[PDB]
Symmetry: C3
Subunit: 622 residues, 3 copies
């Protein structure tokens, strides 16, 4: 049941372009959803009849006159419109919520029994589509995406919850790989965004929106390159104690490093290290929050026949101005007796939007990091895995294996000293220092958090001398530095990052970057080394290559003839980077024939392959 | 009467943005007319009451519930809308047909007694205007033009060709000058202005104009054609602003007569004027295929509860399948199956021709070198005859009394390329792909030797998608309609770009009235029309005087010939130098000794040898 | 009152079905001329009356669906207008409607009574109209009042076009930043605002642009300053920080000229002249009027079975054409008897628009002027003020002071030989001579005045052969040279004028220009001169400067020590333009200390200051 009733309010357009004094007065409106939905705040009550009752399909309002006659109608005859039809969804007493089309103004009206009152407001709605694909209607088809939308004194509206919206998915580009080449034959019914970046050091990121039919070649710098195409998923294409051991493993996810542990008298050791995962975790000093502010304008304090010298009332984005000789004796809006001895004090400030919480950003300094690594090492018959911070000190407390990953070979970061985080998205942005705010620009208003912890704003509010027909406090103001930065935020770092880094946000991090080499010291338990205790003596090895392909995954095929005393298990490895073997161990029999697969990227290569203790040389054309 | 009833169908937007399961479900829509009209295919029946009867103003539909209650209403309360009003025209049982405005989506709804159901579809309509003049409404005024439009298996409103009213633009105030044409233009709306030179190199030039501008164009001496907004195509030039076998060479240029003198020993010179009345350049046409807007058919997916479904190449149209595993769960979630990760759906779909492929298609066509006929009109003495003749050193124009053979043209030239497309009446030089070598979304995406679907082979980059498990719905992307795409990007027709002022024509593919090079011609004139020195008046002592003259006019020349003749007769007057030509070829010689003749030139101080009967002289003047 | 005429039926081209019909509510004309976004519609149906011509505030009447002359009636309740959206009427005037409509592609008037729906629609194009220099889609509740014209709401029977006041919005005051010969203009507008500028010097290099959202806009400041209008704000400008006597005063409003009258034996005289106001009044020969013409098309005179050789009927913009073989028999063409022996004469002409009077322009030659001046001269204890024409002759008949202002130093005018005046606005425009009209260009139609004093038009009307299904006379025509010039009139002279002139219009004039110097001869009444009759000798003056600021209003501060015999009153003045004194007289005491304020625009200046008879030199750094 209700404790308050529908009121009447001054409107500027009422079925006749002339300003009136009707119910259904529009006070505010919210256009913040990713969804194409709207929240309207009117002066009329819905859901109630004559009293504050429970009529699912009834509203009530003030009278055409002013007799305090709160007559009622059926929620059936209340319709919204902007520049076309509008279909409501929910009624919340004083509030409406609908999906409307263009967005030049908003008109709420009653079309009951011939009597037609309608207030309309001069607010501008814009076409909203969330995806990287332009749509005018959520597809029956397509993907589910993170978005926010409206549900279906203070807190009484339809709150802004995050949820899922259906974006369409674009018509997979017919791709054509070539010599360091990718033409991308594209054919979209609609406007799709096409992003790219190299996975090398210099990514030369490249965004564009495409429509209809074109082709789009891109170089492939040998390091490959990622391309997102219209809220598809981001495919990327390429160009086709114990013994302490010190190596240097290149920092590149998923690519195993084969090496040979050489110890006197002992038999060479199976060693493959795979940097399963890298993270670059930098230290984050959150500076402030920021969002769409709201401007509050309290009824002006007017003093009939005196001076009103306004006083600095320290808070939010406060501003006053003292205006003299305001209203003349008779009406002009008020009941003041003197003419040129009047004064009004215009005061107004800013707060956070009712929805600041659901859509804000995070000013954040970022100083140099640390980097963990998911190392997976295999030695002989056992494979183990430890995480390790990359500095000359902290050992990866793997129980059976003590590893320390030396200082990375080149300090590199995707981030700048200063960073903004919007949603899951981080941008390198030189946001102003807390308290050094410029208006209409990003960070126009600031706050250490959402709980309005000392919010300091600068929104260039400008109070205007009010004319004398009504008590209305006028003012201009700057634009919303947030919204303005939003419509002009770049393509995220997750899409521009200089090394194929996969920027992640809660911990700010650069997942799976690829650059430089990592020194690594491994303490292998003596308990897994075999000392010349392979009964087979091995002698007279030679190398023959059966087949070969140039620059493939594993197109190499070579065989090794020899003579061994008995049976055992040899570790095979190449002592020249011009080639690498697919396997690191081989079951040597007495037959004297060992087939091994390898990979290269040359026409006529020369590499020294090594069985157990012996070494040879191989050759072939690819 | 009807044998089938209104059904219910899943929609994606129903008065509340939420997808529903309502009647009035929109299944397809057609946006192909040149007219601004639309064909809609709904789930509800119109024209019938409770049963399949004859209610001119009644429809029926399924219920709000599902009781198979087929309740009825009045065709009065069914309204269409897209982004504004829409006015229907006809009801065809399941079908609607209206004219609608913008074209972002389509919404069919019932606004009866407070209960409001409405399905709406995410289709995009575009502003259609047929003419070369932009209009938003057919004028009360203006021209009638060829267009296609909807009438008012096969049950819809068919697509017939007919006539549409385009507006005609405000005649440009033209100003001729020295090799010059400024075109002062002033249009209320968007009009297309085309041009091309009539010479060898036409440098064609299209532009759409609005409001007020000027547009000069050179005039290369060969003149030039300009169409201006579905006006008719005026063009402007640069003047001020057996028997005896005779061998000449007539320039190939329509309507311009060739005066010559037959000189035979002892015989009296002969009246000879040849007018190439008409030329045609008829090249051999190998139609390759048809092409048009395809339609994609998606048959209900065959799902096998708890097994593998390895799909098989079912050879036809543009067929494609894909086998999707671990599709749906148990009971409700996905089609009444019982296993979870032991499921499989086969997504299959193909393409056909549009219901309207026939009314709007194109014709892939190779064009190898031609033959050219000519409408020759020859006059000799008192008789004028006319024969058609192929232009090769052989085939004689079987005119009964006159045997003509037109030698091989002086320069093989064609307006066409080895490969050509013909859309409506319009031909474009376009390198369409070979039959069976189709690229998708590009022209010729789908092919067919004819409209009777004679082995249609398509490539439309269809891509099947793994269906999610809340409904049995087979998803897929696809390429764009290579036809429509080529349509929105067909150039300006050849009829408007042709390099010699050719008037490209289509049913026989032909280049009417081109103008280039000279035509050798051998004429066998019947001896029976030659006069041998049998003009009694002896003619002697001719001289030439020019009274007036204008330079480069139609016939501004005026000269007189004094002489002395024995008696009366009829002389043939002709000029033995191309620097000038006479308007008349015969003259009634009297004894007076004074003959006035009109001539035309294009020089200041010309020198030409005029010839009466047998005598010859020289004339002079400044123009 | 009551009516004497009834609703008729007319051929329409679109009637609820795209097919042309023969319905009531036939739209005959429409008016789209207001600055307001309002429309005047002329239909075939009568409003305000029932069955007879009575007084039904809410009733209309019309012809029948059939043709029985049955003039049935409805309620003015069910008649609605639309163009491409809703339309709300305002007034009913018998045959006329008047509404505010949105886009403007066509116009549709219809009746939606009891299921029977007739609607005629017309192919006219309405355009978005906003009057201000600020783009708006709705008059603000806020903002300024501006001159505009609009249709009333209370031959001659329509809703007339009266000039009045329209509310334009006022833009968000630019945050301005002054610098070294510099003005950056930080701008932030919700909407499209016009930003004009011009230098106040000789060469103004005027610069218009429309801005939106947020930018910055620097402008040089040429030492002469410069005016900037910003979006129907007011146009701020910023700068760079008896005895006959013959002087030459610089022509510059409000800046006083201090001088010393030196006469033998007499004591120097207080002389300050302020050119309070200047006017440049040139001679105006109005040539013609011009405006939106209207084309009249009288029913064609057709002669059944004969030739109709049309005759030059001398008037307005007359044109005829004789068309032969028009209509076959009856319903072969227009009811007649012969087929190819028919002839129609198509005639049509132009008039002035019903509203030509409220919105026209004025072709006007302008030959060289005269210039008056508001001179305010002060001599000793008395200050007087005379106006004076600036030529070597006419004396300013001030009673006690005879002044003659010599011929100005440089003949300069803001205007060209030929000028157009639209509203209050004058543009330099080479309009064609009377009778030398080109069509669609400005001055397409002409008239010595509004009373249609011999109006001569050239509107390229082109008659077309009418097709034979109806008697309808077709024709093309050129565009409205007026309207065309309107949409393409430049920025007014009031905004481009080369010397900071304030162009004014009724008398055509150039208010308060600033250029060159004015010679002036003054006849000062001997009766105000003091001859060495001040009791003090003055001797030994020196100059000391206390403080100084460079290029300020009056930042200079100097003191003068000396020795005087007695008390008196000295005239202080600077004998070098490098500096000027704020005061011209000083009360000399015996103390020997005189403090004076001065102004300069230099770092280390050198000027010769002069007391009574003595002279010195001053110095300081600023
Ligand atoms: C983007 O890169 C793509 C992928 O390479 C590229 O596609 C290919 O371009 C080449 C350039 O012609 C084409 O190769 C041709 O094969 C066709 C027949 O299909 C021919 O017409 C060509 O012959 C010419 O080119 C030869 C090599 O220069 C010459 O030696 C010869 O004399 C001819 O001039 C040629 O062999 C290939 O067809 C395309 N593939 C397609 C259809 O995309 C594409 O060109 C690049 N696109 C852009 C916009 O950069
Ligand atoms: C294209 O279309 C037309 C066709 O020519 C053309 O119209 C006229 O062209 C000429 C040249 O542009 C213009 O003639 C001029 O008229 C003025 C003013 O009345 C003259 O006195 C001009 O100057 C003469 O003397 C001057 C100094 O000696 C020289 O400037 C000049 O060489 C002359 O000797 C001059 O003769 C005429 O203005 C237009 N008239 C129109 C527009 O109807 C038009 O200008 C061409 N425009 C384009 C877009 O090419
Ligand atoms: C329009 O003109 C305005 C007014 O000149 C101009 O204003 C800009 O103001 C900003 C903010 O002050 C200037 O940005 C910098 O501000 C700092 C400290 O606040 C300066 O001292 C900067 O220069 C430093 O760095 C430069 C490289 O080391 C050196 O040039 C300098 O010696 C300093 O080390 C700098 O001024 C900005 O420079 C001015 N702009 C100037 C002066 O041109 C505004 O930029 C102008 N806008 C446009 C669009 O032209």
């Amino acid at each position: 049941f209700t404790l308050t009733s529908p009121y009447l309010g001054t409107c500027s357009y009422c079925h006749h372009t002339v300003p009136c004094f009707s119910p259904v007065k529009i006070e505010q409106v919210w256009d913040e959803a990713d969804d194409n939905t709207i929240r309207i705040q009117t002066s009329a009550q819905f859901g109630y009849d004559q009293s504050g009752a429970a009529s699912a399909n009834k509203y009530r309002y003030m009278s055409l006159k002013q007799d305090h006659t709160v007559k009622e109608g059926t929620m059936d005859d209340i319709k919204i419109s902007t520049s076309g039809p509008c279909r409501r969804l929910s009624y919340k007493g004083y509030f409406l919520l609908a999906k409307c089309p263009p967005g030049d103004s908003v008109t709420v009206s009653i079309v009951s029994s011939n009597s037609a009152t309608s207030c309309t407001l001069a607010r501008k709605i814009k076409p909203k589509f969330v995806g990287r694909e332009k749509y005018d209607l959520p597809p029956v088809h397509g993907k589910k995406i993170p978005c926010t939308v409206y549900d279906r004194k203070l807190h009484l509206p339809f709150k802004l919850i995050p949820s899922t919206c259906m974006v369409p998915v674009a018509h997979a580009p017919n791709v054509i790989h070539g010599f360091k080449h990718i033409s991308l034959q594209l054919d979209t019914d609609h406007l799709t965004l096409l992003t790219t970046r190299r996975l090398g050091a210099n990514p030369e990121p490249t965004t564009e929106w495409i429509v209809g039919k074109t082709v789009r070649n891109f170089t492939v710098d040998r390091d490959g390159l990622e391309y997102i195409w219209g809220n598809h998923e981001p495919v990327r294409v390429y160009a086709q104690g114990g013994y302490e051991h010190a190596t240097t493993v290149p920092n590149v996810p998923q690519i195993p490093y084969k090496a040979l542990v050489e110890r006197a008298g002992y038999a060479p050791l199976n060693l493959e290290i795979t940097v399963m995962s890298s993270e670059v975790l930098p230290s984050t000093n959150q500076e402030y929050i920021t969002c769409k502010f709201t401007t509050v304008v309290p009824s002006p304090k007017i003093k009939c026949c005196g001076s009103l010298e306004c006083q600095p009332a320290a808070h939010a984005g406060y501003t006053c101005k003292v205006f003299g000789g305001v209203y003349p004796f008779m009406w002009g809006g008020a009941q003041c007796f003197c003419d040129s001895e009047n004064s009004q004090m215009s005061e107004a400030y800013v707060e956070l939007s009712a929805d600041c919480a659901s859509d804000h950003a995070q000013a954040i300094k970022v100083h140099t990091a640390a980097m963990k690594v998911g190392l997976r090492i295999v030695y002989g018959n056992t494979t183990s895995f430890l995480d390790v911070y990359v500095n000359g000190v902290t050992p990866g407390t793997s129980k059976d294996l003590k590893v320390i990953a030396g200082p990375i070979s080149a300090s590199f970061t995707p981030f700048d000293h200063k960073v903004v985080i919007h949603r899951g998205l981080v941008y390198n942005y030189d946001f102003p220092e807390y308290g050094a705010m410029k208006p209409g620009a990003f960070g126009d208003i600031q706050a250490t958090s959402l709980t309005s912890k000392d919010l300091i704003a600068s929104t260039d509010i400008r109070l205007l001398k009010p004319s004398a027909k009504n008590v209305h406090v006028p003012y201009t103001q700057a634009s919303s530095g947030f919204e303005m930065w939003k419509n002009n935020s770049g393509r995220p770092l997750q899409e521009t990052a200089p090394f194929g880094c996969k920027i992640a946000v809660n911990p700010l991090r650069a997942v799976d970057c690829s650059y430089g080499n990592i020194p690594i010291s491994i303490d292998i338990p003596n308990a897994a080394f075999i000392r010349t205790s392979d009964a087979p003596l091995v002698s007279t090895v030679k190398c023959e290559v059966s087949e070969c392909t140039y620059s493939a995954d594993f197109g190499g095929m070579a065989t090794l003839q020899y003579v061994s005393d008995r049976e055992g298990q040899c570790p095979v490895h190449s002592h020249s980077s011009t080639a690498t073997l697919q396997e690191s161990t081989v079951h040597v029999l007495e037959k004297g024939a060992v087939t091994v697969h390898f990979s290269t990227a040359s026409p006529q290569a020369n590499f020294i392959v090594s069985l157990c203790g012996k070494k040879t040389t191989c050759n072939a054309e690819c």
